[PDB]
């Protein structure tokens with residue numbers, strides 16, 4: 001037992017990180033097969049980051065303008081092109097440690113592991129959620145551009161996120177691996193800001209179910225409610241709606257606890273209104289919304305990867 | 307910026323996990339050079355786990371009684387012996403992916419990454435602290451025995467922890483890699499229990515300094531106190547004493563914030579007495595004690611590994 005914020009093992013990704021240098025700017029890149037992916041803003045100067053025309057700035061560049069280094073091994077750049085917001089640098093070496101992979105785009109409400117990275121060297125690993133407003137509350141310092149987010153399905157790495165920038169509130173925005181941003185953000189210095197966020201209701205319910213499985217039952221209660229009356233309360237506490245599909249998805253967690261899904265919503269209704277009253281749940285004083293039902297079924301039962 | 311619970315990248319350790327089978331019991335092992343380390347209770351039956359004489363139960367075993375499997379590759383066991391509470395199985399193959407490593411023993415108050423593991427397959431990675439009572443609040447299900455904890459110093463893996471069991475309160479006990487338990491626990495089923503714990507004061511102060519660096523200043527204040535008067539209050543809130551060495555260690559974090567160490571203790575004094583008053587600190591409603599000063603200087607400045 002126990003419950004903790006848990007990432008996938010990062011070794012399969014660690015074998016794909018490189019550093020890309022163009023001009024005076026050094027960032028991270030992702031090396032799969034014979035291609036290195038990285039944010040396209042690596043070609044930009046400081047005064048280019050204002051109003052850039054990236055088509056214009058890229059035709060002014062060469063194969064040799066780009067330096068790639070995989071640890072203590074230098075890669076020859078043999079081609080370059082822009083796909084949406086990323087640069088895609090053909091190198092003369094197919095990564096000998098290329099895993100099975102996919103490029104998927106995730107939904108807000110889903111989670112992923114991040115491998116934060118500096119000068120092509122992995123520094124740390126941690127779990128994240130895609131916020132309803134398409135930001136992520138990460139930990140990234142200067143030089144972490146190009147660090148990726150990923151999920152692992154037995155032996156297959158689903159890359160889902162590439163880091164691009166930090167917004168005013170200290171949160172981060174990026175793209176999927178085909179270079180299309182998550183949310184209404186752009187790679188040119190403007191006054192862009194995050195936008196209003198919500199709490200991910202379905203995840204909170206999944207985490208309450210994790211706490212019952214681990215022995216915190218003080219917030220359980222006899223009562224029930226309707227899907228409709230519970231949405232009246234989540235609306236007023238800036239929690240997103242719950243659907244019959246969210247209910248059907250919680251089914252397996254309901255049948256292991258014997259707590260009908262609507263019964264747990266009545267619990268959540270009271271937590272929202274009465275607070276937690278000096279107690280905690282899974283060592284937290286907060287209703288935690290960054291675990292999905294799948295995450296719970298992962299830790300509170302058992303699935304490994306290869 | 308940002309601040310999150312962050313582990314070291316796990317790839318160097320992932321290359322060392324195997325599964326060990328003896329009788330009907332399957333657990334994880336650590337393969338460095340030509341030796342596999344694992345909890346010695348793998349040789350025990352169900353009714354052996356009551357009052358075992360491990361010297362007696364091991365001489366009754368053979369080299370072939372032990373099956374080792376590194377993924378889809380089987381290892382020949384050519385020798386076996388007990389070192390304190392672990393088994394140390396000589397195999398005919400030196401792990402081709404043995405990293406630089408050390409076997410160190412950590413102090414309570416220090417942190418480490420765990421790679422949780424099932425049938426020799428890594429499942430997840432997460433950061434932990436050694437509690438003052440020598441337990442760890444982990445996430446481990448049945449079959450995770452032999453999973454290790456570790457720190458990474460540039461290219462060197464300091465292995466510090468091997469998991470052995472789960473205690474009644476859902477916390478976990480284990481050994482260092484020389485087989486000596488952390489704390490007063492034993493590998494034979496008794497009524498053993500965790501013992502009273504404390505909050506790690508020096509770490510809380512380091513985390514408050516992380517929140518100033520990231521922009522949470524609402525708990526700062528003008529006042530100061532003495533090292534002695536602050537210990538009167540930590541004594542009454544079950545927080546361990548603070549020493550002049552803890553003060554000297556916080557020095558660098560004091561000079562980056564301009565908040566004298568004793569000034570931050572007055573902050574902590576008021577948080578303990580007045581509560582947090584419906585606010586949060588680094589997305590937490592709780593005073594967080596599982597980051598050391600080094601962890602803060604790691605994320606809030608920058609250090610990577612290779």
Ligand SMILES: *C(=N)c1ncccc1B(O)O
Pocket residue numbers: 027140141142143144145146164165166307
């Ligand atoms: C990437 N280099 C980066 N990471 C975090 C914040 C800001 C930036 B930036 O685009 O330089």
Ligand SMILES: *C(=N)c1ncccc1B(O)O
Pocket residue numbers: 001333446447448449450451452470471472
């Ligand atoms: C290891 N197999 C283990 N992990 C967690 C809890 C209990 C146990 B046990 O020793 O079987």
